[PDB]
């Protein structure tokens, strides 16, 4: 029952809704595993912002695809 890790994550997602972060629990869960394996949270933030624009603007995702292929 040291699996009260579920509660700590519950409170983080409440703070995330309060701050209007636009993270569901599942995306926050992914972030938590990444940061605890040593990903920098600022870099993670920047990656998430960029992923959001990629999904919103086809031109920028295609620009990514073309750099990735070259």
């Amino acid at each position: 029952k040291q699996a009260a890790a579920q509660q700590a994550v519950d409170i983080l997602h409440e703070i995330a809704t309060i701050l209007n972060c636009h993270l569901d629990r599942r995306t926050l869960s992914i972030c938590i595993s990444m940061i605890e394996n040593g990903v920098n949270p600022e870099a993670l933030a920047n990656v998430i912002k960029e992923l959001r624009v990629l999904g919103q603007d086809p031109q920028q995702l295609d620009a990514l695809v073309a750099n990735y292929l070259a």
């Binding site: 509660q7 983080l12 703070i15 701050l19 209007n20 636009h22 990656v47 992923l51 999904g55």
Partner: protein, 98 residues
């Protein structure tokens, strides 16, 4: 640790892309995932708390005292769960706040 580091992030980079960007089109997904691993290849806890304090103040100034109380009390509920990764996670939320 670099090759091991990337191998360890691979499934999670996939999750991040799948959860955020969208869904089919294999090409876009492999490019987003490569972007995530390439981008990721210290947070100041006093700053984190100061930014959370300023948010509470701002909520109150604009007539959302309840949101301020919510934030303040969730952070209270978080303290017994505090570990070395808590400030970083709040830093991440501060960076995504909107």
């Amino acid at each position: 640790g670099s090759m091991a580091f990337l191998a360890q992030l691979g499934a999670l980079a996939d999750d991040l892309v799948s959860a955020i960007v969208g869904i089919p089109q294999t090409t876009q997904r492999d490019a987003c995932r490569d972007f995530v691993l390439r981008s990721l290849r210290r947070t100041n806890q006093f700053e984190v708390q100061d930014r959370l304090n300023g948010l509470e103040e701002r909520f109150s100034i604009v007539g959302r005292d309840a949101l301020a109380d919510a934030l303040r009390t969730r952070l209270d509920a978080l303290e017994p769960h505090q570990n070395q990764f808590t400030p970083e996670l709040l830093h991440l939320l501060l960076e995504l706040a909107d």
